[PDB]
Design an enzyme around this catalytic site. Structure first.
Site, short mmCIF file in Angstrom:
data_model
loop_
_atom_site.label_atom_id
_atom_site.label_comp_id
_atom_site.label_asym_id
_atom_site.label_seq_id
_atom_site.Cartn_x
_atom_site.Cartn_y
_atom_site.Cartn_z
N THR A 127 0.93 -1.18 0.10
CA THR A 127 0.00 0.06 0.02
C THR A 127 0.72 1.22 0.04
OG1 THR A 127 -0.23 0.43 2.46
CG2 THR A 127 -1.69 -1.27 1.58
N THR A 128 2.13 1.15 -0.05
CA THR A 128 3.13 2.28 -0.12
C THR A 128 3.00 2.92 -1.35
OG1 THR A 128 4.66 1.18 1.46
CG2 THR A 128 5.58 2.60 -0.01
N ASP B 121 3.28 0.04 -4.93
CA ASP B 121 3.53 -1.33 -5.05
C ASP B 121 2.41 -2.23 -5.28
OD1 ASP B 121 2.10 -2.79 -2.14
OD2 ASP B 121 2.71 -0.58 -1.97
N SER C 152 0.28 1.96 4.46
CA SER C 152 0.90 1.19 5.67
C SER C 152 2.34 1.56 5.79
CB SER C 152 0.58 -0.37 5.55
OG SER C 152 1.39 -0.92 6.46
#
Lengths: 195, 241, 204, 236, 243, 205, 213, 229, 233
Positions: free
Chosen positions: C1-2, C17, C130
């Protein structure tokens, strides 16, 4: 939180705020944020609280006042503008929470430079000095010790330099950058300072 | 059935509106109200239409009403359609104070009430309000003011207006005798002069026309008149002019 | 989730990602975290899977309507305020989103960041998700605003690799897009980066 | 006995008892093209003559599809037919969703005929001036016809206002349609009705006559442009 | 309009307000659209008689989507309402279904809006239109199954036309298309045919500032209004100068 | 009623004059003070004074509602509103919002005007319970430190000069005993011919 | 008592792809939290001639969601006279779940089928509507036990990337082996299996019976 | 489509439907109201068509509250619906404000109701004229509600048939200071010899105030003391 | 009436209700605007009784935003509703899109509002013709003009009001592209061919530039009307 210092002189009103946006509480998203919602009729409003509610309320209170300043050729009085936004907070309290704190400040040609103060709820009251946020417990005392009657702008900024350095020394989240809104002689200028 | 539709919101082949001009000439046969702005304050004139001698004529009159502590108007037209507009004007005069904690300027109450008149000639399919009054007051931004509405809604700001009946002869008196700056005492006799020459008389009957004035003494006193106070004004009229 | 964002001397470089997990299990490794809106404005979904994917596609319906009614390219500031206003109505309903809108309007290379409750913040080095804080700290040592595209896309891969290494929520294939002045180029997947190895043993 | 007083509303009744506002809409179905439907022992075919407004335009559709076994063919104004063809389609689809069996053809026509009745009592709404040639196969082959007023007639052969007086007589003397078990002879009889009720100096069927068949195992099949013009439109 | 109402059938079996509004579609600027197997070409007129106009704000060839391109006729003010409803419904279709809308389906929703007097469903109850739309469209595109071209009327009868013509000269341009349009034609054969029909029925000349044709190719499936460069090379061809 | 935005009001009734007093503390939080000029008494009429006490978001809201209704009733009658009709109006305004109550504990001090003059002091609660009291009346956060306090320093009928000293000592001795209120005092003693807005140098603690 | 309206009825759906074929396998056991209601409840329902859909949430949100999708798919076939592709069905199904976002359809679904001449496509998502084009997917009670098995044949982690050929004859036997491994380990996985193979000429309804544990 | 004003204007500048309504009140039973220095007097003759109607059943003097008496003239059907809204509005004021409804606050509300029917689409104006009297804290009052919607602060007037010549009695037989007992004598004379009628007895209903006493309606034997003179 | 089709179609094809509303503009105060390179000078015509109505209460020449001027012609009573409905959307666009409302959207809104009234039920068509001179999304100034039928169009210079044919015909001859600031108002004040009155107390001009509207005082307008009569002879 975010410190919202507001000092009202006899012929000026100086508002101070934090330029730190705290989204995802662990880190600072962006520096040099926009908290002041400048109104066209010499009424610099200053909000504080969550970024989601300060934007949904600062915009709504600006267009609602700009509409009144355009539906009529006149400008809104600072006493009427302070109680208009107070009514919108009390109206938008039963439906939406709106955890915001505003520092109403402006100028009128019949009442001089005024400055109001609000809270989470609608607690409007005209004051000569005030503060908000968690940093209010460290700046509301400095303003009382240095509130000599018939002040001037050059001495009021000295109080803030004697106030910003206090938040940098004995406060939890040490704020360094600040943004001032001097309103001396119908000339609202933005003198943002650091440290 | 739609055969009973009078079509009160339909245009005419000449571009005008039938129900607006019908109500406009309906108020031209009513009483005459005088409007006047002086340096000390604004003064509204009226003309009590005679019905019989059994009217009180001492405690109240149905011509000049009060909207707020700083705005007062003089009804000139159908008295039935005016009470619903005065009630609608007092609500708009208090809704601004409740929403802004300040007195409502008279330049904004006229727009708040002419839109009610304009909306009846726009949709709904109802007859328009057959009334137009000299609403005037005092604000803190532009001093004393006097506005004159219409059954259509196109209001206008004035200095001296005399709508109602015999407006042509009444406006000719105010066009030449109204000075640029008049005091309260001299202005009161001016409204009395143009009113005696309107009903084809020479002096009032003292059980006639009623006046009122604002003259803000930093508090907007808004003093009306009695049947005995008019006697002093009638004496000053009979002396020189 | 980056997710990432750069706003260099050239256009904005967006990089993400491709991991989508549900607690302690990976649902899929081929999710598209980059959701385009127009020929220039391309969003970045994060946080919730479909709690923001619907509004990213719902924004495309509102923008394309305005793109024809006014026959002019909308700005990123207008695309952000529209998405922030429609998201504020669902504040206390149970949503979970993070969206980084970026594009090229009539006034420079604008870039915004919309949160769940409409916390529209404008900046130049945004990131969310996250493992946001890990990738947020890699850019502070190399973002200089005057880096060419060759050493720019490497920084996006180097920042995501260090974010997918310390965090367990993110990972998978690495995507990195580059918004051009009249569109946007692409790079698809790395999936295994060895920036600090010689195949000896495990690092620490 | 007046056409100026008892005529500008659906509410006014004529002195002899007529309803001139809905009878005018009933005369609107006699302005469109023709459509003949024949019911056999186990099949139902629908033939519809399309209409070309010009030489460059394409003939507009006349035969539609409602479900896997229900098909209609309007006659009259097509803008009101789109309201009824989108209502009947939603009724058959809701029956396959709320329940799982096929919608009853008698209950479907009862729901579309009530739509006419609702637009005949109020004064703001107007009567749907369009005839519906509902022809379907549920368990037994059935052919229904609606009118601007609520009516059902499980017909066996019909026509629709264009040259109906020339088509009704051809079908009134033909009782062999029931025993004609062969589908190939049935579609020839249905196509013969359009041939015998066509305007003079006009083309017979130049691939502009829609024909659809529905039956026991046949769903609402639309005859393509390579099967009817070869032999079904060349026997005469 | 004299105590008849909107919903009133005539003794011949037709609506009064429909046939009364059908005469208004023959007053605007003329237009012509041709649908060939290779693509769809549209054409119109640029009546900019008043020299003080900006000649850019007025366009008789708008767009509904990148696939569908349409013309206007009759009341130009009412055309902007149907097109705005078409620009929303077609774009709303792209959200529910990932593919583009079909012209046959896009015309149905526009035709349903012109007869909002006897409807009983939703999606149109927010603003029930009292009068019929006096505007005939010339919708065309390359959705799927080859390019098509449709033409609507206020009566609701939407007939698919291979080559039609609307506007004030809708009758004077029908005879030219009914005799010169061929079955197999390319873009150049259709571009010149879209200009020669606009030359006979026209009070002015076919200069750059007079015509504003637009084409929707079949390969890219995206409409593209012809600019001042492509419109100048096609008017200089003149394949049939007759007078 | 809440500890947030503390404060209290009190009304005393003399022989022919009445007095109403209140503090001036705008408490931001419970134990915080950000303003010393928050008058909790309002001039509702020429001889009908009201004193609100409680949360500040309802004190300013109920004052704007009462001012909107009194002005709508004074110009409709062309006479000032008395106290009996105004007192029962507050009992219906507060009850009209029984589900979403206004956190205020009002008080009403004003001459009944029977040429004659009467005290007519009364208070309410969070829901609007009318409590007519021909003698002193008090409502607010310091209600517990003022009922017994005024019970020992109250005479039957006092003059104008004696009522102000009897009410100033009644408020100053109770405002210094409470912690969330008492940063000032503004007693408004009124006679049928004149009013007096006398402030007090209370303990700023 | 608060009446939790969500129950997991078990069942698994397996999905594979290739170049011109998709395989959707599913067990047919409808069970309660611990008892077994019946041994036959087809979790795979066909939509068109080249597209099917499987699900494994509660049986309430499966017969409704399949009929609601079939109602909209039967409306589109007549309003456009053309069958919908899988690329356009997944968008229609992505907005159906978001229409009930606050009361989600507790049914994770899989979309399979072919649109072009070959083009084997598959679609899998969560219980709210985040559709993503995948190449292999498993959903249900055995979603965590079968997904690592299918991740060894399609994707790779081995040194030598072998198995360059994946024909339909061997790929069917792998899903028959993968669904057998779910029954031997997961509890909710049933016995009867309906192997659905969608080639370029239609669909197949091959069956298989597993352990009735 | 079913709501459009029927009382439209006219080319002469007057609502013809309002003047048509005034012809209905000008052809009804006379209703006389007379105020005094210590009370208000309202009288109305009750035309008896036969001896079958109970005189205690039909009424022309109703009670709005304990101090406001009303008297109508005109359509009796339109009076009961206006009386119901008068009592309902006298309660809503008494619910908010604990005191009694003032006559100026009551007439201004009823005038807003009768005027609303002149402009509301689908309805006709009220075919009656009221006579509201009552003891108020600001003195005695007597108002008359014209069917147009306007009201007049009258002192002594009549509203029924022959309201022009019968009103001339009060133009000469009425002073600015008359007691309550003297008003009854001048009220009976305005209904006895001002009309031919019959010998007025048990057909005249009179309502009094009696100097701040509650609204009392006179009986058939109580009026005999005044009918003898 | 109520929900009744007021604007119906005539037996020939025209809209008899819109044709009457369009005719109402002819009996109204004239107005004229003219676009230039980076500014736009407006000009309205007014008539009031002398020694009364001093500030005129700003009948025409209405501001909608910081850079959106508006001048109407026709029913002055209806401008109180059309402007308020326009100014409300002028702020709503600044609230939803966070950008100042361009003249391209405002003119498309007034034409949308006026067309909504000639199509709804139970409503009277707005008998008012306006002209909106503002700024586009970029720094471009375009002058629009909305007739009561609902159709709008941009204009380089346009004149509406009483007899909008002769004043528009005169503007079609001597209109230069990039006119100077002091020269463009010379052409705007040269439009007194309609109103036969050379007094400065009848025409009110403005000047819109740098996103701020500046008026024109009576002193410089007196020296400008001094050259109009001398140019005639």
């Amino acid at each position: 939180m975010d410190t919202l210092i507001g000092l009202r002189g006899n012929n000026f009103v100086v508002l101070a705020a934090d330029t730190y946006s705290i989204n995802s509480i662990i880190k600072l998203k962006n520096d040099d944020n926009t908290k002041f919602y400048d109104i066209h009729g010499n009424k610099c409003l200053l909000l504080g609280g969550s970024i989601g509610d300060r934007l949904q309320f600062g915009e709504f209170i600006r267009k609602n006042v700009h509409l009144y300043q355009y539906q009529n050729n006149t400008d809104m009085f600072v006493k009427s503008f302070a109680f208009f936004t107070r009514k919108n907070l009390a109206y938008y309290l039963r439906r939406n929470p709106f955890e915001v704190n505003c520092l109403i400040a402006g100028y009128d040609k019949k009442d001089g430079y005024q400055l109001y103060w609000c809270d989470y709820l609608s607690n409007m009251d005209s004051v000569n000095k005030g503060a908000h946020g968690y940093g209010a417990y460290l700046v509301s005392a400095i303003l009382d010790k240095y509130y000599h009657e018939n002040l001037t702008v050059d001495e009021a900024l000295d109080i803030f330099k004697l106030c910003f350095e206090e938040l940098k020394k004995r406060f939890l989240l040490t704020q360094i950058n600040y943004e001032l809104r001097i309103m001396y002689d119908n000339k609202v200028e933005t003198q943002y300072v650091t440290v | 059935a739609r055969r009973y539709d009078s079509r009160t919101t339909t245009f005419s082949p000449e571009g005008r509106l039938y129900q607006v001009e019908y109500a406009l000439e309906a108020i031209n046969n009513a009483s005459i109200t005088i409007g006047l702005i002086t340096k000390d304050g604004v003064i509204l004139g009226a003309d009590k239409v005679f019905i019989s001698k059994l009217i009180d004529k001492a405690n109240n009159y149905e011509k000049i009403y009060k909207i707020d502590k700083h705005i007062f108007c003089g009804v000139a037209g159908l008295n039935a359609d005016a009470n619903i507009l005065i009630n609608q004007s007092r609500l708009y005069a208090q809704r601004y104070l409740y929403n802004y904690n300040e007195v409502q300027p008279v330049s904004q109450l006229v727009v708040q009430i002419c839109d009610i008149k304009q909306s009846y000639t726009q949709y709904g399919g109802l007859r328009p309000y057959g009334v137009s009054f000299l609403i005037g007051g005092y604000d803190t931004k532009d001093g004393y003011q006097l506005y004159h509405t219409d059954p259509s809604g196109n209001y206008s700001g004035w200095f001296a207006t005399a709508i109602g009946t015999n407006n042509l002869t009444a406006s000719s008196v105010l066009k030449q005798e109204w000075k640029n700056d008049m005091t309260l005492e001299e202005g009161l006799l001016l409204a009395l002069k143009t009113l005696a020459k309107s009903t084809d008389t020479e002096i009032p009957k003292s059980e006639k026309i009623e006046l009122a004035y604002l003259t803000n003494k930093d508090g907007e006193v808004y003093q009306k008149y009695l049947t005995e106070k008019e006697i002093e004004e009638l004496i000053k009229l009979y002396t020189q002019k | 989730t980056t997710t990432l964002a750069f706003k260099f001397k050239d256009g904005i470089i967006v990089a993400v990602d491709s991991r989508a997990s549900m607690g302690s299990f990976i649902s899929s490794q081929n999710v598209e975290k980059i959701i385009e809106i127009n020929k220039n404005i391309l969003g970045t979904m994060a946080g919730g899977a479909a709690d923001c994917l619907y509004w990213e596609k719902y924004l495309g319906k509102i923008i394309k309507i305005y793109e024809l009614r006014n026959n002019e390219k909308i700005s990123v500031r207008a695309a952000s305020t529209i998405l922030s206003n429609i998201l504020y109505q669902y504040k206390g309903y149970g949503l979970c989103c993070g969206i980084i809108l970026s594009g090229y309007d009539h006034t420079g290379f604008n870039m915004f960041y919309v949160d769940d409750s409409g916390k529209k913040v404008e900046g130049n080095l945004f990131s969310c998700g996250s493992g946001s804080t890990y990738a947020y700290s890699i850019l502070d040592s190399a973002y200089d605003y005057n880096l060419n595209l060759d050493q720019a896309v490497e920084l996006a891969r180097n920042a995501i690799y260090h974010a997918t290494f310390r965090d367990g929520g993110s990972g998978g294939k690495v995507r990195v897009f580059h918004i051009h002045k009249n569109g946007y180029d692409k790079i698809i997947e790395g999936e295994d980066v060895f920036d600090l190895h010689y195949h000896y043993t495990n690092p620490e | 006995m007046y056409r100026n007083l008892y005529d500008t509303d659906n509410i006014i009744y004529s002195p002899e008892g007529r309803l001139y506002q809905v009878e005018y809409a009933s005369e609107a179905i006699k302005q469109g093209t023709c459509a003949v439907a024949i019911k056999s022992k186990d099949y139902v075919v629908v033939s519809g003559l399309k209409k070309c407004i010009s030489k460059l335009s394409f003939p507009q559709e006349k035969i539609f599809k409602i479900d896997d076994y229900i098909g209609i063919s309007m006659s009259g104004i097509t803008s009101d037919a789109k309201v009824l063809t989108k209502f009947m389609q939603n009724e058959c689809l809701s029956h396959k969703f709320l329940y799982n069996e096929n919608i009853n053809i008698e209950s479907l026509v009862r729901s579309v005929a009530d739509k006419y009745q609702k637009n005949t009592q109020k004064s703001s709404k107007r009567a749907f001036g369009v005839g519906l040639m509902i022809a379907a196969y549920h368990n037994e082959p059935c052919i229904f016809e609606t009118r601007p007023n609520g009516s059902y007639f499980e017909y066996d052969a019909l026509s629709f206002g264009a040259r109906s007086h020339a088509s009704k007589t051809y079908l009134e003397k033909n009782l062999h349609l029931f025993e004609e078990c062969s589908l190939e002879e049935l579609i020839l009889h249905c196509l013969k009705a359009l041939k015998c009720s066509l305007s003079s100096e006009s083309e017979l069927t130049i691939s502009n006559t829609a024909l659809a068949v529905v039956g026991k195992n046949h769903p609402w099949q639309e005859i393509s442009s390579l099967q009817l013009e070869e032999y079904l439109s060349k026997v005469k | 309009e004299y105590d008849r109402g909107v919903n009133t059938f005539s003794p011949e079996g037709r609506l009064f307000q429909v046939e009364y509004a059908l005469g208004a579609i023959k007053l605007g600027s003329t237009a012509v659209g041709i649908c060939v197997n290779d693509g769809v070409i549209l054409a119109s007129e640029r009546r900019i008689s008043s020299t003080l106009i900006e000649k850019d704000s007025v366009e008789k060839l708008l767009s509904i989507d990148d696939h569908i391109g349409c013309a206007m006729s009759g009341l130009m003010a009412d055309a902007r309402t149907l097109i705005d409803y078409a620009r929303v419904e077609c774009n709303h279709y792209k959200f529910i279904y990932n593919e583009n809308i079909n012209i046959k389906s896009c015309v149905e929703l526009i035709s349903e809006l012109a007869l909002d007097f006897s409807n009983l469903s939703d999606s149109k109850r927010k603003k029930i239109m009292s009068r019929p739309f006096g505007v005939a469209l010339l919708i065309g595109g390359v959705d799927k199954n080859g390019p098509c071209l449709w033409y609507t009327e206020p009566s609701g009868t939407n007939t698919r036309f291979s080559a039609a013509s609307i506007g004030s000269a809708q009758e004077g341009a029908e005879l030219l298309l009914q005799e010169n349009y061929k079955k197999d034609m390319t873009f150049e054969q259709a571009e010149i045919l879209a200009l020669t029909v606009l030359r006979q029925v026209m009070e002015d000349k076919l200069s750059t500032s007079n015509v504003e044709i637009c084409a929707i190719k079949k390969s890219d499936q995206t409409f593209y209004k012809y600019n001042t460069d492509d419109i100048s090379r096609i008017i200089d061809v003149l394949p049939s100068p007759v007078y | 009623i809440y500890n947030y935005n503390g404060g209290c009001v009190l009304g005393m009734s003399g022989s022919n004059c009445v007095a109403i007093a209140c503090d001036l503390r705008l408490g931001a939080n419970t134990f915080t003070t950000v303003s010393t000029k928050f008058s909790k008494i309002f001039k509702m009429n020429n001889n009908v004074y009201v004193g609100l006490s409680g949360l500040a978001t309802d004190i300013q809201t109920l004052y704007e509602i009462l001012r909107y209704r009194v002005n709508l009733y004074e110009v409709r009658q062309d006479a000032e509103m008395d106290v009996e009709c105004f007192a029962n109006m507050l009992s219906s305004i507060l009850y009209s919002n029984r589900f979403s109550p206004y956190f205020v504990n009002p008080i009403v001090v004003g001459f009944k005007l029977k040429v004659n003059y009467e005290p007519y002091l009364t208070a309410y609660d969070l829901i609007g319970a009318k409590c007519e009291t021909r003698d002193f009346v008090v409502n607010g956060v310091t209600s517990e430190q003022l009922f017994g306090m005024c019970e020992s320093l109250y005479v039957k009928d006092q003059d104008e000069n004696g009522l102000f000293e009897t009410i100033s000592q009644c408020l100053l001795s109770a405002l210094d005993r409470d912690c969330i209120s008492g940063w000032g005092a503004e007693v408004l003693v009124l006679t049928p011919e004149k009013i007096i807005k006398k402030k007090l140098k209370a303990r700023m603690d | 008592k608060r009446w939790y309206p969500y129950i997991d009825n078990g069942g698994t759906v397996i999905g594979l792809t290739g170049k011109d074929y998709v395989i959707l396998a599913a067990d047919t056991r409808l069970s309660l939290s611990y008892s077994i209601y019946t041994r036959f409840c087809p979790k795979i329902s066909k939509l068109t001639d080249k597209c099917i859909i499987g699900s494994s949430g509660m049986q309430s949100d499966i017969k409704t969601l399949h009929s609601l999708l079939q109602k909209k798919i039967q409306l589109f076939v007549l309003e456009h006279s053309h069958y919908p592709d899988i690329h356009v069905i997944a968008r229609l199904l992505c907005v159906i779940l978001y229409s009930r976002r606050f009361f989600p359809y507790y049914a994770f679904n899989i979309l399979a089928g072919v649109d072009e001449n070959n083009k084997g496509v598959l679609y899998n998502y969560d219980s709210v509507g985040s559709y993503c084009e995948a190449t292999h997917s498993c959903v249900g009670s055995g979603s965590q036990l079968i997904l690592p098995i299918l991740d060894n044949r399609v994707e790779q982690k081995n040194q030598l990337i072998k198995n360059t050929n994946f024909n339909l004859g061997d790929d069917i036997n792998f899903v028959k082996d993968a669904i057998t491994s779910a029954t031997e380990r997961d509890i909710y996985t049933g016995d009867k299996t309906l192997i659905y193979v969608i080639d370029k000429m239609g669909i197949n309804v091959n069956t298989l019976d597993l352990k009735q544990d | 489509e079913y709501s459009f004003s029927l009382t439209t204007f006219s080319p002469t500048g007057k609502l013809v439907q309002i003047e048509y309504a005034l012809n209905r009140v000008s052809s009804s039973s006379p209703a006389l109201g007379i105020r005094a220095k210590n009370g208000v007097i309202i009288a109305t003759e009750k035309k008896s068509p036969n001896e079958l109607i109970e005189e205690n059943s039909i009424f022309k003097i109703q009670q709005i509250s304990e101090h406001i008496g009303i008297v109508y003239a005109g359509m009796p059907g339109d009076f009961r619906v206006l009386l119901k809204r008068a009592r309902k509005e006298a309660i809503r004021y008494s619910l908010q404000y604990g005191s009694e409804i003032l006559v100026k606050e009551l007439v201004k509300i009823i005038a807003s109701i009768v005027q609303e029917f002149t402009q509301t689409g689908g309805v006709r104006p009220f075919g009656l004229s009221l006579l509201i009297c009552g003891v108020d804290v600001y003195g005695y009052h007597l108002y008359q509600i014209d069917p147009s919607g306007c009201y007049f602060n009258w002192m002594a007037t009549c509203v029924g048939k022959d309201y022009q010549n019968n009103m001339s009695f009060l133009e000469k037989r009425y002073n600015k200071d008359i007691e309550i007992e003297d008003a009854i004598h001048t009220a009976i004379l305005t209904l006895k010899e001002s009309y031919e009628g019959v010998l007025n007895e048990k057909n005249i209903e009179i309502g009094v105030a009696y100097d701040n006493k509650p609204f009392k309606i006179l009986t058939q034997n109580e009026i005999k003391d005044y009918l003898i003179e | 009436s109520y929900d009744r089709a007021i604007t119906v179609f005539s037996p020939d094809g025209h809209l008899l209700q819109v044709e009457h509303a369009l005719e109402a503009v002819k009996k109204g105060g004239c107005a004229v605007a003219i676009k230039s390179s980076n500014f736009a000078v407006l000009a309205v015509e007014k008539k009031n009784i002398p020694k009364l109505q001093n500030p005129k209460t700003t009948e025409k020449l209405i501001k909608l935003d910081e850079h959106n001027c508006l001048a109407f012609a026709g029913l002055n009573a209806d401008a109180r509703v059309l402007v308020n409905k326009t100014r409300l959307e002028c702020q709503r666009y600044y609230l939803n899109m966070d950008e100042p409302a361009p003249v391209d959207y405002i003119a498309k809104y007034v034409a949308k509002v006026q067309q909504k009234f000639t199509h709804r039920g139970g409503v009277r068509p707005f008998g008012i013709a306006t002209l909106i001179a503002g700024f586009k999304n970029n720094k471009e100034i375009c002058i629009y003009q909305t007739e009561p039928s609902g159709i709008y169009a941009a204009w380089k210079a346009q004149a509406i009001g009483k007899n909008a044919k002769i004043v528009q015909e005169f503007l079609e001859k001597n209109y230069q592209e990039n006119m100077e600031q002091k020269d463009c108002i010379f052409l705007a004040l040269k439009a007194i061919f309609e109103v036969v009155e050379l007094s400065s107390k009848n025409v009110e001009v403005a000047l819109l530039t740098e996103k701020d509207l500046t008026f024109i005082e009576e002193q410089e307008i007196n020296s400008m009307v001094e050259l109009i009569d001398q140019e005639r002879t």
